[PDB]
Amino acid sequence: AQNPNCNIMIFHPTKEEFNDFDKYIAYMESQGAHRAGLAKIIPPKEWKARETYDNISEILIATPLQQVASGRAGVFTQYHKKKKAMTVGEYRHLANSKKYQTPPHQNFEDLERKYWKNRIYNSPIYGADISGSLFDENTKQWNLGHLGTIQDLLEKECGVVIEGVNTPYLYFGMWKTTFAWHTEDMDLYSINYLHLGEPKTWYVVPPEHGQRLERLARELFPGSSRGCGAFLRHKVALISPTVLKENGIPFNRITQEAGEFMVTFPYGYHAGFNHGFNCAEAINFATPRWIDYGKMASQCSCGEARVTFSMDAFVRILQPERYDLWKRGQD
Ligand SMILES: O=C(O)CNC(=O)C(=O)O
Numbered sequence: 001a002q003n004p005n006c007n008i009m010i011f012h013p014t015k016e017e018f019n020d021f022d023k024y025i026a027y028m029e030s031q032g033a034h035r036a037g038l039a040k041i042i043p044p045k046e047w048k049a050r051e052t053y054d055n056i057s058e059i060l061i062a063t064p065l066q067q068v069a070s071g072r073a074g075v076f077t078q079y080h081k082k083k084k085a086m087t088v089g090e091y092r093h094l095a096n097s098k099k100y101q102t103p104p105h106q107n108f109e110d111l112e113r114k115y116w117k118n119r120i121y122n123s124p125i126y127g128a129d130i131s132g133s134l135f136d137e138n139t140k141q142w143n144l145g146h147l148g149t150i151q152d153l154l155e156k157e158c159g160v161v162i163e164g165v166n167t168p169y170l171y172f173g174m175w176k177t178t179f180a181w182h183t184e185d186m187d188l189y190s191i192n193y194l195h196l197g198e199p200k201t202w203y204v205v206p207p208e209h210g211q212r213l214e215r216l217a218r219e220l221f222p223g224s225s226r227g228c229g230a231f232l233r234h235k236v237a238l239i240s241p242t243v244l245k246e247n248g249i250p251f252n253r254i255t256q257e258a259g260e261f262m263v264t265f266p267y268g269y270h271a272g273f274n275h276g277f278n279c280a281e282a283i284n285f286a287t288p289r290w291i292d293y294g295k296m297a298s299q300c301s302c303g304e305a306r307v308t309f310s311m312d313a314f315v316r317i318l319q320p321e322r323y324d325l326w327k328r329g330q331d
């Protein structure tokens with residue numbers, strides 16, 4: 001078995017190897033990458049996502065989210081308070097302000113220490129989940145707006161034709177902006193490209209050990225667990241590396257820098273934080289190996305997780321028993 005300790009792997013494809021996205025994913029899995037839940041892909045030196053970022057300041061963040069924490073430093077939830085719209089130029093200036101800017105630090109480890117010590121005492125503003133793309137249309141390789149769609153994959157593997165679409169999303173971050181512990185909708189893959197700015201630190205639990213993280217989460221967030229049998233779908237819970245180590249949960253960490261891709265694999269729980277002002281683009285995708293994960297994915301039916309139009313078909317086809325109850329949740 002390849003990668004039996006479930007380490008995060010880093011790949012350096014050549015420009016030739018960068019042509020065929022599907023083929024490269026399948027290669028990385030042949031080497032065991034999926035066992036970690038997360039891989040890094042460094043693009044060939046010849047590749048670029050677009051020519052410059054000089055002209056992005058006029059993108060609108062219609063609903064910036066202030067991430068307000070509750071709990072203790074290593075075990076907390078966050079709620080998202082909606083804020084007034086602002087442009088990316090306005091958001092960048094706010095990220096760089098004395099109130100929100102990255103503190104002085106020695107290196108990424110020192111910054112990580114400071115994040116976990118102090119995150120809860122601040123409420124950073126995240127421009128998350130903005131439909132759009134920063135890839136140039138002429139970028140032909142690993143252009144996250146030109147991937148094969150999940151609906152097309154389902155149709156190719158299973159024969160069934162379904163409604164829905166699959167488009168990318170932009171994330172504008174600042175220091176301490178946080179993504180809570182989650183897997184993707186329907187335990188899909190994700191791919192995330194850091195277009196510019198400061199790094200993003202990731203934590204990940206191997207898919208084969210995801211239920212260990214779930215059981216800890218039920219212990220640590222006991223009211224939320226009684227409320228919903230899949231409350232990590234709400235994407236609000238944080239648990240620090242220190243707490244994971246104290247409870248014996250297997251995990252790994254890695255820091256993504258500008259110009260690098262990350263892939264999350266089916267049922268790979270992940271969480272993390274931004275180091276400073278940045279912009280990432282991410283989209284969900286599928287392969288043949290996902291189908292079985294999709295059929296087994298948990299679902300929130302309490303009503304909190306509220307998701308996309310296109311998830312309806314995935315539930316309807318892959319999980320027809322759960323469909324009725326899940327749809328009651330979504331209405
Ligand atoms: O970058 C973020 O805030 C969150 N991204 C992801 O969870 C992802 O790409 O799967």
Ligand SMILES: [Mg+2]
Nearest residue numbers: 055056058059
């Ligand atoms: Mg602009």
Ligand code: NI
Nearest residue numbers: 183184190270
């Ligand atoms: Ni994710």
Ligand SMILES: [Zn+2]
Nearest residue numbers: 228300302304
């Ligand atoms: Zn729920």
